[PDB]
Every structure is written in structure tokens, then in C-alpha cells.
Amino acid sequence: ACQCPDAISGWTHTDYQCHGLENKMYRHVYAICMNGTQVYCRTEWGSSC
């Protein structure tokens, strides 16, 4: 769920955090746009906590 005005030039993500209610780790995946912006694309879910 993300789109850049022209194109995606790169790919990054925040670090995993524990979700206190879900008891599961999540992080945010961001695409880097050609224009310099970042767009939040998905939430990645990891191991338990």
C-alpha cells in the first residue's frame, strides 16, 4: 500500500518494536522515492513478545 509520484528508488524499514496488546513485534516498511520522499508501504509482523 504505497506509491511514489514517479518511481521507487530504494527500500528501508524501522526497527522492530513490541506491540503490548498483540504481544508480537512489528516494524514499518518504507519505500524511498526518486523525489527524495519516503512512503509507508506495509507493517511487517515478526516474532512474539
Side-chain angles (χ1 to χ4, degrees):
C2 61
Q3 237 181 307
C4 290
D6 288 333
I8 292 171
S9 58
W11 207 259
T12 62
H13 53 81
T14 70
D15 285 338
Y16 274 120
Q17 269 181 27
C18 185
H19 200 288
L21 293 184
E22 293 303 318
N23 297 306
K24 175 166 288 156
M25 308 182 337
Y26 68 94
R27 64 185 183 190
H28 294 348
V29 180
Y30 278 88
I32 304 173
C33 297
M34 277 213 319
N35 76 345
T37 63
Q38 293 193 5
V39 293
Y40 177 9
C41 298
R42 73 170 67 191
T43 306
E44 177 169 12
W45 292 91
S47 52
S48 299
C49 56

